[PDB]
Design a binder for this molecule. Structure first.
Ligand SMILES: NC(=O)c1ccc[n+]([C@@H]2O[C@H](COP(=O)([O-])OP(=O)(O)OC[C@H]3O[C@@H](n4cnc5c(N)ncnc54)[C@H](OP(=O)(O)O)[C@@H]3O)[C@@H](O)[C@H]2O)c1
Ligand SMILES: NC(=O)c1ccc[n+]([C@@H]2O[C@H](COP(=O)([O-])OP(=O)(O)OC[C@H]3O[C@@H](n4cnc5c(N)ncnc54)[C@H](OP(=O)(O)O)[C@@H]3O)[C@@H](O)[C@H]2O)c1
Lengths: 237, 230
């Protein structure tokens, strides 16, 4: 499908990749964008074609309220996410793993469940912004990795359930992007503008598993070519 | 790491694969097995462990400081899709057992394993690597557990603890009563889990279905996805 004339909802639209997606959807001729934010005061772009909607994706009531006000949706981009950057065992915060799972898996799932009825009725597409770490843990962020892997399996199951109803479901798997989430990750990081372009370009390709950037491509190719060798290298300190 | 002489703990020891593992560990010479069960010979120490109950997990670890082998076998499959689930919280229930419960066990027992040296085997599922639509929330919880196993493997490798995942297809236990044949016999599954300690692989695929899916996810990925999902 085309961006031109679509009715989109983007979560996490107040900053980072989501703010970039909001701006690009507008520039490329979207009819309307529901800009999901946790505090409407956080949004700097509230002009024409933008409908700010309060959505903490972990809050089932806010998600339901948003879906009921967005029955014209044709494109959902599940962009909101949380990376607490902690290992699974030696975590400073033992509850961080549960918080990441709550946003990246249960929150995305809440959005899928609430917005799918309208997408089935209208036709359309869902893009889930996951991570290359859905495919392999980085030990220092292994609980983020686990939450994104759960979200990838969920995206596969949702694709199967929605395929007979003409709703396309795409996963995008990036390496590091230059946003506040990765403030502590050393460069090189993908520029937001490049990441925005790659997310939106996924609608024009045929792949439902889309790797963004060199790191993500290298990991996917290495896992296919020699899974065991790559694991032994990446997971032995 | 031999089973002979080891001190093992296996969860889910009252039925299915865990009960088979308890029996085989004894036959193969474990000097002591902490048999984790939800409702309770001299080499067997029954221990009350709901793996989602952090206090029961902590109490069990405090009474198992001699452990050298942990087998995280307990698991739950609600067999529901992610979107049209009959129970909207089935996904949360599976995540609680298969991810958070296994994580609780890893966190509580790792200190003694680091002190004694030893190994952890996590019984996951081939569905950690790809969803089946009718069981996609089970798949998600096992994929979470697989990434967690990888992270734990890296954290524990410098501290004399080997961490292995086992990824079976269907096994002939109560969990898979509604999965049609064919299913791996419990005894074959037991042999494959315990043989993992003598092999060098960090991921062990159990049975022909699991091996075929693993091969396809590396070498035939787009077509395998289409076959399972669309
Ligand atoms: N290196 C990277 O940055 C990187 C790499 C791979 C994948 N990704 C993924 O890319 C996506 C965008 O992240 P980013 O890089 O733009 O990070 P970011 O700058 O930290 O922005 C994260 C966004 O998610 C929102 N969010 C977090 N928890 C939320 C919740 N419970 N409900 C609603 N919104 C919530 C934040 O809202 P508030 O402003 O209200 O906090 C913010 O808008 C995420 O899914 C992330 O996992 C990022
Ligand atoms: N086809 C299959 O059977 C299959 C396929 C792939 C992977 N696996 C995995 O193999 C492992 C063993 O399952 P199984 O085949 O032996 O199934 P099973 O016969 O149904 O046994 C499941 C076991 O898990 C225990 N358990 C569940 N929730 C628990 C909790 N909160 N705390 C403690 N114990 C809990 C059960 O305890 P109670 O008896 O007290 O309920 C039971 O001992 C699981 O991790 C499963 O996911 C099985």
């Amino acid at each position: 499908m085309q961006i031109e004339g679509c009715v989109a909802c983007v979560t996490g639209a107040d900053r980072g990749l989501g703010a970039g997606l909001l701006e690009a959807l507008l520039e490329r001729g979207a009819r309307k964008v529901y800009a999901g934010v946790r505090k409407k005061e956080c949004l700097s772009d509230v002009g024409p074609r933008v409908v700010p909607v309060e959505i903490d994706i972990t809050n089932v009531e806010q998600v339901a309220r948003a879906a009921s006000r967005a029955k014209d949706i044709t494109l959902l981009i599940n962009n909101a996410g949380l990376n607490r950057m902690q290992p699974v065992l030696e975590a400073h915060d033992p509850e961080a793993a549960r918080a990441e799972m709550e946003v990246n898996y249960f929150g995305t799932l809440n959005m899928m469940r609430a917005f799918s009825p309208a997408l089935k009725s209208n036709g359309g597409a869902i893009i889930n912004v996951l991570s290359i770490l859905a495919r392999v843990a980085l030990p220092s962020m292994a609980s983020l990795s686990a939450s994104k892997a759960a979200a990838l399996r969920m995206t596969e199951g949702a694709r199967a359930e929605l395929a007979p109803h003409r709703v396309r479901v795409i996963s995008v798997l990036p390496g590091p992007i230059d946003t506040e989430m990765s403030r502590n990750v050393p460069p090189p990081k993908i520029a937001v503008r490049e990441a925005v372009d790659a997310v939106l370009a996924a609608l024009e390709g045929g792949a439902d598993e889309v790797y963004m950037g060199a790191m993500a491509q290298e990991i996917a190719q290495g896992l296919a070519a020699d899974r065991q060798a790559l694991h032994a290298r990446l997971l032995t300190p």
